[PDB]
């Protein structure tokens, strides 16, 4: 029952490209990657090699293949304590998944600021460019269960736990800069509406159903984040290629006591990139684990996800200077009005060891702040402060969830709290209360001050009556949707129109569709008309005369709201499919791989069967996957080298592979006789931008391909794809 | 007054076809469909129309849109108890999902036996053909989470709770007649191997990964159920079109105390029908809820799932008369050797009201037997008896899960058990122990007898030493795999080969694929060579010389092991896509739609946009979905009527619709100018079997199409689908 002779069961503990080795727990793949938090988990890491198999009480097991029975065909005996312990632990494996964001993928890394921020905040983790803060990040979808698919259309969660020297700070954000609703009291309404409908629990991972669009049509506050969801923001290529936002306005407090309003941003250093809808939806079927896999593999390859932290900063005296309320989380602050100041860089550089222990049990909370940070009255933030504490007690089984290893602070913690289910800490303090004399009052309160001080809330002025009332300043719902719409490129606008049209086609009750279209007519007539036409709906004269909402503080657009208007492409860590034949021209392949390797782009070698093929020069080429097994959905570009093209010329899967990649706007490159495939994608002989072609794969061919890949997708091909049957 | 004035928000309370009306809770869709269990749930059903919104304490709420704050832009106040109750209930909505079979879809129904089985069992529910037993049935996949996809390749669970007059009997079976392992002590091993891998929690809903095939390769007892899983059995078309089996040998006990060995069968009255792999995998992307949806809609349409319960019965004296052990759950009993005796009929005729409350909380247990039934020493069954009790106490929150409405017996239950979390029953008995005099010893024990007697175990002789030892009678692993293989049609054998080949290609460590292939060579050389060829592996001369395993009691095949070898087609409840154009020939459509209606086959009218088109004669045709919105994966056949074909002839989606349906072996029917689509699928001029074509949709056009549909798929097409890039 043993390992192969050749040690091929065990992956190399060295960075390797996706597919080259079986993936492995982080501490075994990258044992020399350390930080303070990863080190501190060492008390609970358990190995296995050379150890005897035992019960949980330490008793060695002789026979782990059989129950104890009276004779070998007899009844199982109740005294089999080994069987019952093993079955009981199995029987009790599951815990409640998260009520939202149950589907998520996490990794370890570190953060450091570029320069001390002491002028605007006394937060210790921002005080020194050479003081490094361990982090654990979990990225997530929102709607679906923990076993749902990665590449659904949904908002994404982006939660970062900072293990600072002055306490855990969790920054619990999303990949769009606003939320659907204004006041936390409506959260259960909204989430019930987007989640599977309660009679039949359908659909998973999708807003494309009646109840979501019903709530939307009756709650126009939702429309801004709905625009972002229906755009390609809702289908990121990778967690590495999306933006992050805290959404709410928070405060920074400096040593002088000055408060500055702040909104938090993460910039992906790999650039912004999203799938297209047909590709994203098909990919939930071909690989429901695509984003989880891609994140794990990037870290195993050395393509560490990196993000830049950035702050939009607004002085206290400028609180009311915009035509939107800063405390309204359905409103974004355009970068054109308030730029993002770069603050520091976060690098995710190691995977967990056990997904359940570290990812499933991690607990983040936006209420987890530190001195130098504070809240505001944002009525959605205010309610979140209550919710995460409450849900985690039942999800994680009691109030000692901070003792679960992943959640533990790395800085000191001491207090008079005691007991609770699964209490780990054995307190020796003779006192469990303060004030006490019997322990000289330790642990003691600490006055606030410039560093290492106790937490004190900023003394904000509160004046008003106890009311359940939405601020009048929050009652404007169309101008930000329209700013977003106007800031998208034409192809991005088309994909938005296609998102609304596809989703509303799945709404069974037609008046719900009509009411949503009426809401679109309040944002932009061109958008409303394009959706209406796809739905066979005709706008009335009144609808055509709805006056468009005002510009946002004179802005007619802000290109930072577009994924693509401003190029920010980075090809490192992207992947190319190379479609092999049984007599590959080894000169083509040499040049291809050399150029890819120079830019940090990975390759997957594909064929019509598994095993190996032999190139013209005797080189044996191992096959990663079949054309069916690793579809074009899972790669960024396709390259077909010369060789014996007749081997694959009439293979349906190989032809379809090119048709699918072509449809989904990916760069394709064809060398030598592979150019015969130009017929399948049915498109000229002078060639076309987006298809690289040459007698062979030279320097120039690869440079062209690599340039297209830096632009992510071939948008100019869009008019050509409605004709292809794929 | 948010409801539309025309009342179109509310589905009609009468049977309607899939897509015609919004779906609804069962008691609102079908209020007149009643049984004793459904009636008994009336005490906990809660309505809503005309009632005030309240807290859970009954306090009316005035403003469910806002939190209580100090000023309309101020902080939220801790005194907002309305907000806190609503968010707390929300925060605590989730419970742990089931450890296996977390993904499942359920319905209410009723069972009746065909005749009294008093001669072989004193079970009350089988005593009288006029005795109706309410049932609740849940069908499930096994590996994936509750939010994973339906049409994965997996075993399916088929669990039936019989609410009998002498106790709940749960028949907790699968859709194949054997299990992967022999002894319950290995269940955590096997389940851990198939489930997502522990470092990264990948893959969901798939056995296509290293750990599963590592375990299979080291445990040849698994091979028989592995053959079933790799066959089209692993991908059923519908829960309505798969077989059910209790797997284990149990006993029936009659009034005279005679024991008869029994294995339980469910026969689907709708026939056996499965998907093909590329279809199944893509459908997990296009509609991960396809089986759940299909079940619910069948019941809403009146296409009630019906199954015939059947027994294979073996006299006690015949225990040792087979080449295989009756207590070995990796062995099936061939129907050629022991026929299934028809026992009664089960009809599922009403959906749940609330999925969580009825489906998610339902608890089934194979240990829930009734007098007239008993267990055997099958060492897998023996361990199951321990596990379900134990898991349900954590899953459902305590020992009073039998008081959760869906789980309650409809017969009396009284005993001395008290307390426990969530105790609903208020016991008035002065006594909580027996024997007692202070309540005259009530409730009292009941002697066993012919009817209404207490449970007494059959007095089976036990003789042996206490051993953890597998019976040598269980040590044979290849003959049942071979009998299965040899019983499959040539196309089924091909789909088995492709299943192994596809799955093994995703195993990253090659030696593992090699080891599986070796195991295949012990089953059947043709099978092993064909998988080997697809994996680029050459068998050794030793491998080529392995002698096949013996026949199973002289049988070299049993056709009842095939899905298709014996026609059992049933078209009622199936569905056809009809591809519209903007001037449909209304005569073809009247004939098409009435032909389908007469046989109970549903239609979905499809186009390039939503809304309406107008037929040649002015008939308005309402559009159900777009070509991309409702892909050929979701239908059984496709019909293209004549009209203005030019409207859709260049539509890539409309052409691809036919390609996809063609590839997946579905019947396609083309009327008049729709025959121009023959070129998209490469159909010869003189036609081919599996494509119905005529000048018009009259005469025998619809009969021929319906004949194809009764045979499910056009298997003869398999060699043709190899070209076609789809
Ligand atoms: C700006 C709007 C919000 C954002 C950006 C957001 C973000 C997130 C994220 C990223 C997670 C997952 C953390 C993880 O990976 O474990 C999460 C979980 C959760 N959120 Fe929020 N959220 C928002 C609004 C709300 C509201 C209004 C409430 C309720 C008042 C709420 C309650 C919850 C709950 C109960 C969890 C599960 C936490 C756990 O089980 O540990 N969220 N949220
Ligand atoms: C012939 C073999 C088996 C069959 C046919 C089978 C069938 C099933 C089915 C259909 C379910 C889902 C019931 C539902 O819909 O809620 C289930 C659940 C479950 N099974 Fe089995 N099973 C088998 C073997 C085992 C074994 C050997 C064990 C452990 C010793 C086991 C432990 C469990 C557990 C813990 C659950 C979850 C039950 C709950 O949470 O209510 N099963 N089984």
From Swiss-Prot, chains A, B:
SUPFAM superfamilies (UniProt xref): Class I glutamine amidotransferase-like (SSF52317), Heme-dependent catalase-like (SSF56634)
Binding site for heme: 388
Disulfide bonds: none
Alphabetical keyword list: Cytoplasm, Heme, Hydrogen peroxide, Iron, Metal-binding, Oxidoreductase, Peroxidase
One GO CC annotation: cytosol
Enzyme class: oxidoreductase
Pfam family, one: Catalase-rel
Reaction catalyzed: 2 H2O2 = O2 + 2 H2O
Ranges for region Disordered: 432-466
Coiled coil: none
Cross-link (3'-histidyl-3-tyrosine (His-Tyr)): 365-388
Active-site residue list: 101, 174
E.C. code: 1.11.1.6
Cofactor(s) the protein needs: heme
Gene Ontology biological process: DNA damage response; hydrogen peroxide catabolic process; hyperosmotic response; response to oxidative stress
One example GO MF annotation: iron ion binding
Record's keyword annotation contains Metal-binding: yes
InterPro entries according to UniProt: Catalase, Catalase_AS, Catalase_clade2, Catalase_clade2_helical, Catalase_core, Catalase_haem_BS, Catalase_immune_responsive, Catalase_large_C
Subcellular localization: Cytoplasm
Described function: Decomposes hydrogen peroxide into water and oxygen; serves to protect cells from the toxic effects of hydrogen peroxide.
Family: Belongs to the catalase family. HPII subfamily.
Subunit (UniProt): Homotetramer.
The protein, known as: Catalase HPII
Native species: Escherichia coli (strain K12)
């Amino acid at each position: 029952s043993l390992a192969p002779e050749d040690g091929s069961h065990r992956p190399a503990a060295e960075p390797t490209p996706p597919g080259a080795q079986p993936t492995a727990p982080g501490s075994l793949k990258a044992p020399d990657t350390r930080n303070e938090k990863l080190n501190s988990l060492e008390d609970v890491r358990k190995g296995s090699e050379n150890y005897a198999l035992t019960t949980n009480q330490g008793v060695r097991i002789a026979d782990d293949q059989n129950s104890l029975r009276a004779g070998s065909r007899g009844p199982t005996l109740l005294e089999d304590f080994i069987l019952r312990e093993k079955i009981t632990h199995f029987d009790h494996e599951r815990i409640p998944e998260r009520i939202v964001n149950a589907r998520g993928s996490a990794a370890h890394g570190y953060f450091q600021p570029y320069k001390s921020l002491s002028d605007i905040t006394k937060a210790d983790f921002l005080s020194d460019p050479n003081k490094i803060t361990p982090v654990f990040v979990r990225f997530s979808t929102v709607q679906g269960g923990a076993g749902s698919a990665d590449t659904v259309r949904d908002i994404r969660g982006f939660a970062t736990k900072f293990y600072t020297e002055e306490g855990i700070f969790d920054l619990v954000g999303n990949n769009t800069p606003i939320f659907f609703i204004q006041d936390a009291h409506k959260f259960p309404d909204f989430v019930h509406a987007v989640k599977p409908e309660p009679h039949w629990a359908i659909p998973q991972g999708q807003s494309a159903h009646d109840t979501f669009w019903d709530y939307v049509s009756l709650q126009p506050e939702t429309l801004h984040n709905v625009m972002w969801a229906m755009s390609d923001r809702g289908i990121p290529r990778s967690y590495r290629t999306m933006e992050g936002f805290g959404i709410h306005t928070f405060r920074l407090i400096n040593a002088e006591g000055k408060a500055t309003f702040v909104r938090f941003h993460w910039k992906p250093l790999a650039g912004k990139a999203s799938l297209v809808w047909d590709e994203a939806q098909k990919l939930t079927g071909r690989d429901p684990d695509f984003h989880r896999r891609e994140l794990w593999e990037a870290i195993e390859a050395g393509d560490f996800p990196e993000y830049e932290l950035g702050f939009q900063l607004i002085p206290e005296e400028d609180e009311f200077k915009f035509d939107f309320d800063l405390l309204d989380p359905t409103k974004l602050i355009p970068e054109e009005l308030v730029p993002v100041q770069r603050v520091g860089k976060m690098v995710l550089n190691r995977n967990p060891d056990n997904f359940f222990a570290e990812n499933e049990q991690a607990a983040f909370h936006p209420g987890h702040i530190v001195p130098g940070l504070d809240f505001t009255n944002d009525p959605l933030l205010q309610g979140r402060l209550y919710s995460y504490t409450d849900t985690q007690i039942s999800r994680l089984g009691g109030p000692n969830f901070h003792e679960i290893p992943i959640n533990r602070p790395t800085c000191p913690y001491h207090n008079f709290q005691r007991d609770g289910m699964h209490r780990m800490g054995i307190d020796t303090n003779p006192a469990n209360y303060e004030p006490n004399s019997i322990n000289d009052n330790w642990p003691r309160e600490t006055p606030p001050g410039p560093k290492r001080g106790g937490f004190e809330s900023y003394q904000e002025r509160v004046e008003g009556n106890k009311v359940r009332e939405r601020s009048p300043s929050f009652g404007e719902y169309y101008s930000h949707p329209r700013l977003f719409w106007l800031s998208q490129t034409p192809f991005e606008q088309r994909h938005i129109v296609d998102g609304f049209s596809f989703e509303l086609s799945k709404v069974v009750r037609p008046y719900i569709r009509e009411r949503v279209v009426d809401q679109l007519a309040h944002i932009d007539l061109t958008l409303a008309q394009a959706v209406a036409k796809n739905l066979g709906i005709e706008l009335t004269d009144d609808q055509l005369n709805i006056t468009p909402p005002p510009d946002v503080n004179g802005l007619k657009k802000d290109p930072s709201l577009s994924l693509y208007a401003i190029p920010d492409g980075d090809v490192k860590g992207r992947v190319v499919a190379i479609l092999l034949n049984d007599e590959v021209r080894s000169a083509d392949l040499l040049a291809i791989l050399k150029a890819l390797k120079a830019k940090g782009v990975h390759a997957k070698l594909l064929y019509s069967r598994m095993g190996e093929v032999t190139a013209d020069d005797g080189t044996v080429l191992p096959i990663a996957a079949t054309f069916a097994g690793a579809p074009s959905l899972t790669v960024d570009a396709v390259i077909v080298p010369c060789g014996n093209i007749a081997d694959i010329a009439d293979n349906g899967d190989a032809n379809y592979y090119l048709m699918e990649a072509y449809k989904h706007l990916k760069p394709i490159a064809l060398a030598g006789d592979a150019r015969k495939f130009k017929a399948t994608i049915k498109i000229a002989d002078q060639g076309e931008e987006g298809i690289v072609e040459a007698d062979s794969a030279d320097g120039s061919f690869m440079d062209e391909l690599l340039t297209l890949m830096a632009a992510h997708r071939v948008w100019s091909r869009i008019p050509k794809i409605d004709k292809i049957p794929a």
